[PDB]
Design a protein around this ligand. Sequence first.
Ligand SMILES: *[C@@H]1O[C@H](CO)[C@@H](O)[C@H](O)[C@H]1NC(C)=O
Ligand SMILES: *[C@@H]1O[C@H](CO)[C@@H](O)[C@H](O)[C@H]1NC(C)=O
Ligand SMILES: *[C@@H]1O[C@H](CO)[C@@H](O)[C@H](O)[C@H]1NC(C)=O
Ligand SMILES: *[C@@H]1O[C@H](CO)[C@@H](O)[C@H](O)[C@H]1NC(C)=O
Ligand SMILES: *[C@@H]1O[C@H](CO)[C@@H](O)[C@H](O)[C@H]1NC(C)=O
Ligand SMILES: *[C@@H]1O[C@H](CO)[C@@H](O)[C@H](O)[C@H]1NC(C)=O
Ligand SMILES: *[C@@H]1O[C@H](CO)[C@@H](O)[C@H](O)[C@H]1NC(C)=O
Ligand SMILES: *[C@@H]1O[C@H](CO)[C@@H](O)[C@H](O)[C@H]1NC(C)=O
Ligand SMILES: *[C@@H]1O[C@H](CO)[C@@H](O)[C@H](O)[C@H]1NC(C)=O
Ligand SMILES: *[C@@H]1O[C@H](CO)[C@@H](O)[C@H](O)[C@H]1NC(C)=O
Ligand SMILES: *[C@@H]1O[C@H](CO)[C@@H](O)[C@H](O)[C@H]1NC(C)=O
Ligand SMILES: *[C@@H]1O[C@H](CO)[C@@H](O)[C@H](O)[C@H]1NC(C)=O
Lengths: 247, 50, 81, 127, 343, 114, 99, 115, 118
Amino acid sequence: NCVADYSVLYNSASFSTFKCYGVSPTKLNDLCFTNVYADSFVIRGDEVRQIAPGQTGKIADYNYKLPDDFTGCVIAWNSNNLDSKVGGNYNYLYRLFRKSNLKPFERDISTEIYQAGSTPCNGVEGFNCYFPLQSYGFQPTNGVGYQPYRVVVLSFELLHAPATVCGPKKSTNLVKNKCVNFNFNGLTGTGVLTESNKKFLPFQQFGRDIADTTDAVRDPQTLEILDITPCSFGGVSVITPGTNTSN
Amino acid sequence: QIAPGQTGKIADYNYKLPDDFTGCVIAWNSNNLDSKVGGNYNYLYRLFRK
Amino acid sequence: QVAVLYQGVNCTEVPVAIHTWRVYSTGSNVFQTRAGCLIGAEHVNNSYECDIPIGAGICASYQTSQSIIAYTMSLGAENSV
Amino acid sequence: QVQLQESGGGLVQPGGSLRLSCAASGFTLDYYAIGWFRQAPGKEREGVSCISSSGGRTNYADSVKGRFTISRDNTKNTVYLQMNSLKPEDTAVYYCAAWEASRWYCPLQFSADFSSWGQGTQVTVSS
Amino acid sequence: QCVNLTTRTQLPPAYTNSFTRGVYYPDKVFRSSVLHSTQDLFLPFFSNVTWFHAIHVSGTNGTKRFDNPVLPFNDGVYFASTEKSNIIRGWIFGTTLDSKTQSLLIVNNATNVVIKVCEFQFCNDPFLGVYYHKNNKSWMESEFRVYSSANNCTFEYVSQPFLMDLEGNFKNLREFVFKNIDGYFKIYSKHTPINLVRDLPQGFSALEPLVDLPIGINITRFQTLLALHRSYLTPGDSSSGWTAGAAAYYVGYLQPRTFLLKYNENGTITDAVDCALDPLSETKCTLKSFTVEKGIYQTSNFRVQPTESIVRFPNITNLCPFGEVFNATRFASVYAWNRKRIS
Amino acid sequence: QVQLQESGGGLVQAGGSLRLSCAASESIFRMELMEWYHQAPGKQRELVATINRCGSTNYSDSVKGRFIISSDNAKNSVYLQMNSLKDEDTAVYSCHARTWTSYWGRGTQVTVSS
Amino acid sequence: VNQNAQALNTLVKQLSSNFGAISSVLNDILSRLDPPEAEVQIDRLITGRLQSLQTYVTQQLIRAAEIRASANLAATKMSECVLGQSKRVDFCGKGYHLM
Amino acid sequence: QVQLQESGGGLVQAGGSLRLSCAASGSIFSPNTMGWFRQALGKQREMVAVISSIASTQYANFVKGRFTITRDNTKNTVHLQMNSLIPEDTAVYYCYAVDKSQDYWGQGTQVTVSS
Amino acid sequence: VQLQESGGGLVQPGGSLRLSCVASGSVTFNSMGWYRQAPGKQRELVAQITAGGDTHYADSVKGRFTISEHRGKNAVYLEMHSLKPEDTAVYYCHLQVPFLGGGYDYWGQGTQVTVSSG
Ligand SMILES: *[C@@H]1O[C@H](CO)[C@@H](O)[C@H](O)[C@H]1NC(C)=O
Ligand SMILES: *[C@@H]1O[C@H](CO)[C@@H](O)[C@H](O)[C@H]1NC(C)=O
Ligand SMILES: *[C@@H]1O[C@H](CO)[C@@H](O)[C@H](O)[C@H]1NC(C)=O
Ligand SMILES: *[C@@H]1O[C@H](CO)[C@@H](O)[C@H](O)[C@H]1NC(C)=O
Ligand SMILES: *[C@@H]1O[C@H](CO)[C@@H](O)[C@H](O)[C@H]1NC(C)=O
Ligand SMILES: *[C@@H]1O[C@H](CO)[C@@H](O)[C@H](O)[C@H]1NC(C)=O
Ligand SMILES: *[C@@H]1O[C@H](CO)[C@@H](O)[C@H](O)[C@H]1NC(C)=O
Ligand SMILES: *[C@@H]1O[C@H](CO)[C@@H](O)[C@H](O)[C@H]1NC(C)=O
Ligand SMILES: *[C@@H]1O[C@H](CO)[C@@H](O)[C@H](O)[C@H]1NC(C)=O
Ligand SMILES: *[C@@H]1O[C@H](CO)[C@@H](O)[C@H](O)[C@H]1NC(C)=O
Ligand SMILES: *[C@@H]1O[C@H](CO)[C@@H](O)[C@H](O)[C@H]1NC(C)=O
Ligand SMILES: *[C@@H]1O[C@H](CO)[C@@H](O)[C@H](O)[C@H]1NC(C)=O
């Protein structure tokens, strides 16, 4: 339920990571989104690559898994002077050991001590009993691969639902009966619009009677329904006599 | 940021390479020749463009 | 009422492999044809025209005891001159 | 996608030992000659040791002559630097780099430019 | 607060089925004179739903005990209600139904509606009681004993006060398709009038989406709130409730199947066919039609699956000469070296 | 998985009462039709009673008024309470239900002494 | 009448599959991604659609050949059974042919 | 912003006892997990017990058989009961609230026992 | 979400305006209401129309407001005459969808009407 301007957000100290999969950043403003999810955490440099669809690693399989069909953009800021302290900022825990891998966007916080051996640890450390969540020793003098990185993943769903977050593109006046390139809430197309006599259910937006083309649409500004017809086309054939007969 | 098909500050505002680029980029570190104790400001850097 | 034909498989196998509707051994006589395993139809010694082509000379039809029957096709009324 | 990763560093006691692993992804490290480099805080990058692409030619530094050993596993696309009898003078961040032959003759004792610099690992010797 | 009621006695209820009921609109698109196949979680045709009387008379004397036990919540529930005196007032959802975990609540406050999400301390027997007396002006005075306390509740909703009551077989039926998916609480609902009925009748009606609620919480259990026409302090035996709990509700559990829906020219869902019910239904689905002419059709392919995986390599050998090495009485010196060969 | 199995027949006196309990493992309601047939000795099988899914019930002339159909919807079964039995009702009573395909049980014997 | 239509229907339906890409509609990709990855998606899309069109063309060619054979038979029957009296057995109709 | 109200530190002789306590005054969405972490100078963080409100115990082997945790469900407060301390165990303890959204940390409680 | 609403603009005192809760398709109801609220005060009813046709009005809007219904376009319109500066507010159209004997009106969307000499 917001009008977003990610273009201004892009010019932010030229931060290194703007990795958007499924959407190009420059064209990102024009497209608009049904919902937005912002997921934030702090990572190490060498594990930065693990934040990607279809990527392997400790964090991907044990801490934070992204879907193979992930659509969204990962952003990260260097946090050496913010999250790293001289004595070590051990406030961040990473799950090194898990009984099974993680599904995408799965956060099932389990603090149990995993049993490395056959004897049940029963929540008690000892022989073959190690706690998965290990702290991280972030220091300003630590290496770039061992220094904090503030990571936010922005996940978006391009479902066929009334979008809530759209960029600041101003809607122009409606034109009727002339073949135009229309953009209705991210749905782009080309054709001629006409007044439709169809009835739409109060929760119904589109209409497709042949299963691939949306013949009808509902405008958000004015609730009138509009049916869409292709811009017309056709081959051109040439009727001629023989060349030396005439021209 | 010199390689074709990649987007960046140099790739978009300093040197854009075509998609069908046929040639070789050559690079070498220059610390004993270019870098100067007082700082070599003589090299320019364009960041903003239409 | 319908019948189900598993094409090319012995009947000592149908009820337990697949993982929906079930078959049940008592659900029919579970006929065994050269074409496969047939479920839901009886067997009639009489022969008529091929109402429905099943295969290997077997044809099925509907009669008002399961409503569907399967028989050996009759090539035609016998005649001698 | 040409990545070099330094793995195996840490804080060690003088007189001990440690092993470094340089990992290559996205390209063939067998075709590249590898040479480790160190830059201690307040010290310039001095050559650790260089090993050729085939592995038949080895370079060493007199500061670590007889203490640092280099081996490569071209099948596993890794080059290992084995360190023995460590001293506090070796407290530095370590990089592994890949480059070709700079001249005639097989050994690569002469330093030259280096293409791919890894993230690097800091190995600290103090007790 | 709350009031402790009597034991439910774990009474055994009867059962009934939805004969082609519970189909809703799974999409926000409009189709005219088409047949469509949808992979979605529906209520299976002719499946058995468990039916609960609002008031259960263990004896005809008036031994009336409320019947509203806790029920699991897996992939949403279909809820039907036949009634004419608004005995059902709402529902409560959660995992543990206490302040230990987050929970959700929809209630009817006498004449308004209320939607609240937080960690309510629900009591063991939540209910709404209403009672009247001809003397003075009582006229359905109410006690609300649904929960104990509510803290840090995020979502709130109130509405206008309007609903009449009697304070004659026009038992109205209400259908709901409560489904929590993607942190949302879709509530498909349908209100229709029927008369001359004792149990739910056989009929067909498309169900429309009333509202989506953003709650984003874990849900594994649910309950219901019934309007008590009595009071625990002075509980009467007979006629204290409404027609001995003849008005009742029905709970069914949805399953993920495929359906063939028939949109007419008006876009109103008219007929539906469940593919996974009968071989004839499979034939109709594979032909994308409702009528099939005489013949033989091939629907699917059947294969046998392996039961257990078996790996074997040849163990075939002798034991191995190890005990004579480790368990040997004497060991060789460090210069006359004893190596034993093992193969 | 015997299905449509019957039980409740045997020796009985004239004018008595008896119960038989044809019950099936499959869902009772999906049947949409189940009936009753009996085969008197030296007599071809004859329909006794019927019940569909809607609830409509028909009986033959020698059925009405004496024993009627019922089916408790708690345990899947159909109930036909034999009442005031006569000597000409001695037959092999069988129950039958038909989903997409027909089903049949072995039936049960009923004998009346007079 | 049905066969043709059915085939053509399938052709249109083939436009609704992504063919291993991330979308089945071209304008979404064209308005979402930069050309370097756009082209990587478009090549898959055109490969799939071109394969479908080739299959449709081959089916139409075979069906047209069969219809040509049927039309030749019909022309022969019109030339012989109608324009004159035929003596070929069972060519025109059962029994001795009159007209 | 969840504030962890830590208190209950000080100086105690060998073999003594204390009663630590930290309270979560934040929103506390959904089930939470309550933990205690031990941090000594020149060392890393070692947890004490991350027992949740329900079960799983989660007791370390370092202080096994000496320390116990009491929970008050009314105010969502956890008290770290302290007894039979060995001077090796002296370090800085931090309250740890896991919650559903993100984890929080306290301001630290000093524990020092020697003789 | 269902219903959507629009319409309404700023005007001078003593004029007449034409507000509308624009229809969103065929929906069922019995009582269509017009509602208002201004900052610093609670929200009060403006008008109400039953399915039969009975009208209910606030005291301050007597003889100055008229409600009309259009089943052709399912639209409910309100023509307001004799505007005084006290009428500046945000306006809503509350529904009568039957939900458990009646409830869940859809007034949640509003249109801002400002009446002032400047
Ligand atoms: C030119 O036209 C004449 C008649 O118009 C024709 O006879 C002749 O064939 C034509 N020339 C050619 C090359 O076809
Ligand atoms: C199945 O039936 C066929 C009939 O020809 C027979 O040859 C085959 O042995 C049978 N298989 C089994 C396992 O009984
Ligand atoms: C008739 O069919 C039965 C099987 O139902 C079979 O045993 C019998 O041999 C058949 N008789 C003839 C004459 O075919
Ligand atoms: C009470 O109900 C029982 C049934 O459980 C019945 O036998 C008895 O006659 C009833 N008595 C009265 C007074 O209603
Ligand atoms: C029900 O409670 C709400 C607040 O939770 C209140 O506004 C409303 O007036 C109550 N209902 C009645 C009929 O008083
Ligand atoms: C009578 O009803 C009124 C309701 O206005 C209530 O205030 C009063 O207490 C009642 N009196 C008795 C004796 O119940
Ligand atoms: C909900 O809580 C139950 C506890 O019974 C747990 O098993 C399940 O994983 C939880 N689901 C989610 C999505 O948190
Ligand atoms: C559509 O519905 C309306 C009323 O709901 C009805 O009058 C009309 O006849 C329907 N359309 C057709 C084509 O029958
Ligand atoms: C292999 O089999 C022999 C006898 O068949 C048995 O004595 C021996 O223990 C087996 N080996 C193992 C490893 O089980
Ligand atoms: C040695 O012998 C003893 C007793 O015979 C036995 O318990 C032990 O397991 C043997 N050692 C090994 C390694 O098996
Ligand atoms: C429906 O009823 C049958 C017997 O009447 C019972 O076995 C079955 O469990 C019931 N269905 C459900 C979902 O409980
Ligand atoms: C959340 O609720 C708990 C108890 O229910 C309370 O202690 C805490 O202060 C609440 N949080 C806020 C932010 O009000």
